[PDB]
Amino acid sequence: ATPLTSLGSEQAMFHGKHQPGITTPMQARGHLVAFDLAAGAGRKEAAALLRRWSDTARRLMAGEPAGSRDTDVARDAGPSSLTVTFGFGHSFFGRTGLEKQRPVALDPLPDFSSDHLDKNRSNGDLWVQIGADDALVAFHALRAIQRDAGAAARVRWQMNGFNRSPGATAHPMTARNLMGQVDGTRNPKPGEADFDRRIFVPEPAWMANGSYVVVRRIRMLLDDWEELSLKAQEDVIGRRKSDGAPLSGGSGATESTEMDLEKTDGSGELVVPINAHARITRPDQNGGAAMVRRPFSYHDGFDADGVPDAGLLFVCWQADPLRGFVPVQRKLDRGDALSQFIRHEASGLFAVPGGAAEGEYVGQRLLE
Amino acid sequence: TPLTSLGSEQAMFHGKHQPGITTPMQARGHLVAFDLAAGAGRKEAAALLRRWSDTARRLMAGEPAGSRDTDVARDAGPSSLTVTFGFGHSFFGRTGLEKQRPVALDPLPDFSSDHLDKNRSNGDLWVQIGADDALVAFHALRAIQRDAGAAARVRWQMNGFNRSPGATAHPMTARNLMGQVDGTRNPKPGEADFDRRIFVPEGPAWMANGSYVVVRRIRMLLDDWEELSLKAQEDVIGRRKSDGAPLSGGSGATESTEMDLEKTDGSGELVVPINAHARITRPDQNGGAAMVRRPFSYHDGFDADGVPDAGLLFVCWQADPLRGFVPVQRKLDRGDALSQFIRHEASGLFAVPGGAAEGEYVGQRLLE
Ligand code: HEM
Ligand code: HEM
């Protein structure tokens, strides 16, 4: 019996080989933020900021207040699986005299033909991912990180997201997105032999045990999507909406049943379409290209014509974007059945170092 | 209490009163207003409320929509979903129902501290959606909005949140983003004068057992608030942040300890300040004016200058605004210590009829 109090009492590790928020389970509430360093903030001011943030992360993740004038917003809650994760944009390095430590992996993402990117709401010197299963715990951490920046950095953009809550379902199971799809079945998992090689930089040296995140604010064209038949929607993905099983499966097939990419109709046509999203994204269709996807859904209102500003805050993790996000998205751009129903409207690519050790701050190897 | 309770708990649709008034607080909220389209009169509004009521009934039972279900809520339990319907002053002129317009919908005063967005205020029709799972809540918002179809457009829509079930080690009163205990003195069904305070009795007959809701989008000036000392913040409310007790209370006092309004300190100054919010808002300071308060917090991001668009979606419930919201806000406008740290930025006043009986729709006695 998992008690209801688990939601609040569950606590994620701040200190680790890897920073939290990568392999951490899905969280109900998410806030992504980018900061740009102030004019005249250099290496010294950035190091001080990262120390402040790391101290704040550490305290909050353990359910402790920030300091004396902590706002009390998270008071009485448990840690609620709070995680805070820090990353560095390509632009950070030129602001701090660290151009020679800028990883080749931060080279800008391609200009994909399907891009519709608000560049103000994209990129940034610094990125912070906050997640928790309690909205006050999450907001408290966002506000404390944002206040820590003070005048030394400014908020460039900031997006809010959500997922299913713990306990929403009778048993824990893969999440859904706002298209109503089972979303998360085929991620690489810790314990798989190639997981570390796929996801983490091995033990420039400041990125040891780090990962590269790609964030994409992807609007779902729900007004078009929701006029489609079940067949049409399922053909876009290649998996069933009911349980996430491959379309190649029978009634007995489940979410775990392997996809049969050769199966055909009586009539000769492939049961899993040739441009289905869950076919064409697989590592075995992309020379081994792989990523961990760990997103939040978003809804930020309606425009004048009733169009919802709703979608997926797509967040993926990889040891090298050129063996993950980039080749896959090159294929998806025009080659994916899903592309017609979505719009990439903001993006970022950030270097996320290893977890801090006792006494350390996140990114200390880089800044020291 | 098992974690699955978050999902399995179910609020009732059918009843003497609509859900979402006395219902416990929920972790996720969507408030939406709609305006009737050209060509939508009384008969089109009745059909709309019939649609909406059927959707609310199904969804509140954890069932899919009756048709074109998106699967977004699939596998989740009801998650304490509630859906609540009301009518604005403007509705009655659009449908030929001017003779049924309650006096209670007469426009709120123009308070000197108002800073209202006219286009995010008011509206013909109001819907309140809340749940403890965000996919359940979004699925209900999207279904209600899609039921509107050609009958009505979305005028405005706001997202809110609260604490999650299980975030605390045992159930406690909510906090808000000012870090205050928020909800202590909310009237409850078993207390002495509750029905007379909150519900139209068995004023136009179609509102029998209904209530009047006042919605205020109140931005919290957190940048100014959070530079105050603890003493200053506690003086603004009249209650302690740590435990919500009256400042007049001793070391043993808790949130429910009765406030002493006459208690002075060693220098003869009142311990609960004369302009403290939790003094001046009490029914006994307002000729018996009272309301149920059942809000959500909001955070919609930052403006270009770093100012959070964050605050309280204040939602209050009363039998008559003239003996609830209106006289209290008249007092608060300039009189309240809190007023300095908030701004009222949107408003709505809606008539929320009684609940639907078995085989009925909400608002039936008005629209048919
Ligand atoms: C809003 C946009 C998107 C939606 C709705 C979506 C939805 C899905 C769904 C339903 C699945 C199948 C179940 C699963 O294995 O998780 C999936 C798998 C996947 N998606 Fe997406 N996706 C989106 C965008 C992206 C993008 C932009 C990328 C990469 C550039 C991506 C990469 C993948 C990968 C790698 C898989 C797993 C492939 C495999 O089976 O091995 N998706 N996606
Ligand atoms: C951002 C805006 C506001 C904040 C932060 C706020 C905060 C609070 C807090 C902390 C309490 C004390 C604990 C409790 O009993 O709930 C309280 C009580 C109350 N507030 Fe507010 N409030 C706000 C706006 C309003 C407005 C606009 C009204 C009515 C016009 C209102 C009416 C009340 C009433 C009636 C009480 C209970 C008084 C009693 O002890 O009988 N508040 N509020």
Author numbering:
A (entry chain B): 69 to 271, 280 to 444
B (entry chain A): 70 to 271, 279 to 444
What does the article say, verbatim?
Furthermore, in situ X-ray-driven generation of haem intermediates in crystals of the dye-decolourizing-type peroxidase A (DtpA) from Streptomyces lividans is described. We describe the use of online UV–visible spectroscopy to monitor the X-ray-generated formation of an oxyferrous complex of the dye-decolorizing-type peroxidase A (DtpA) from Streptomyces lividans, allowing its structural characterization. This is a particular concern for haem proteins, which can occupy a wide range of redox states and are exquisitely sensitive to becoming reduced by solvated electrons generated from interactions of X-rays with water molecules in the crystal.
Therefore, the observation of this band together with the λmax of the Soret band are strong support for the crystal being in the ferric haem oxidation state. Examination of the electron-density maps and structures for the two successive DtpA structures (with accumulated doses of 0.99 and 1.98 MGy, respectively) revealed no substantial differences in coordinates or B factors and no appreciable signs of specific radiation damage beyond the haem pocket.
